[PDB]
């Protein structure tokens with residue numbers, strides 16, 4: 001199973017570690033792109049050296065209570081970073097944005113994947129994505145990402161995620177985006193309580209019925225912090241366990257903050273699955 005973008009390919013035969021590079025106004029400080037660029041390129045370098053095969057560049061925070069970012073603010077931070085990395089390294093670059101101008105401007109500087117947690121729901125996003133012909137990640141979410149509001153109720157969270165996926169795949173094809181260009185992500189922590197999150201992880205293997213790559217992001221999330229009752233900087237062990245459970249079930253891309261450690265853990269999973277008559281646990 002491979003992805004094709006920007007004259008290159010990504011083989012999904014093994015788990016890939018996607019490192020996170022957030023370049024928001026509150027971190028990519030001192031205003032409209034400071035010498036925070038060296039910082040970003042430095043940070044990327046470490047991630048690559050640690051074994052990341054994909055880097056997720058985002059100019060907007062999607063945490064509860066997060067501010068909205070303007071197209072200008074976003075453009076100012078993401079584009080320069082995407083370009084500097086594309087020019088310097090061979091990694092795959094995914095862009096975490098929901099804005100059509102950022103989508104368009106990103107393809108042009110070499111981005112390989114459009115990771116929109118909003119699944120191209122913003123006016124003009126679907127059309128901008130299609131035009132680029134790049135792979136798109138579709139994520140399940142109930143509500144507004146940045147709501148300090150409570151988690152919905154679900155009749156059955158897994159059935160709802162499944163049906164959402166069917167509907168979104170359809171929407172994409174109707175717009176020109178071939179099913180073969182999609183990645184699916186259940187969206188851990190988004191409009192889901194503790195129970196819902198562990199139900200989605202327990203049954204991850206059942207989402208293979210779509211025959212599409214699966215991307216997951218549990219790193220330092222609430223589903224861990226709540227369970228173990230620990231702060232954000234004390235969640236590495238839990239984070240690692242979630243990555244292993246997902247990978248063991250055949251997830252293809254794991255979004256994380258702790259690249260080195262996850263890569264090691266993934267090396268153990270690969271050794272195991274290769275000795276496993278059918279390459280996956282269910």
Ligand SMILES: Nc1nc2c(c(=O)[nH]1)N=C(CO)CN2
Pocket residue numbers: 061062063096115117137139185187188215216217218255
């Ligand atoms: N594809 C994907 N992208 C994300 C995800 C996630 O869970 N999956 N979680 C986030 C948390 O701010 C940010 N971006």
Ligand SMILES: Nc1ccc(S(N)(=O)=O)cc1
Pocket residue numbers: 062063064189218219220221222232
């Ligand atoms: N939505 C969200 C909440 C917390 C985090 S974390 N893992 O940086 O604490 C990431 C995304």
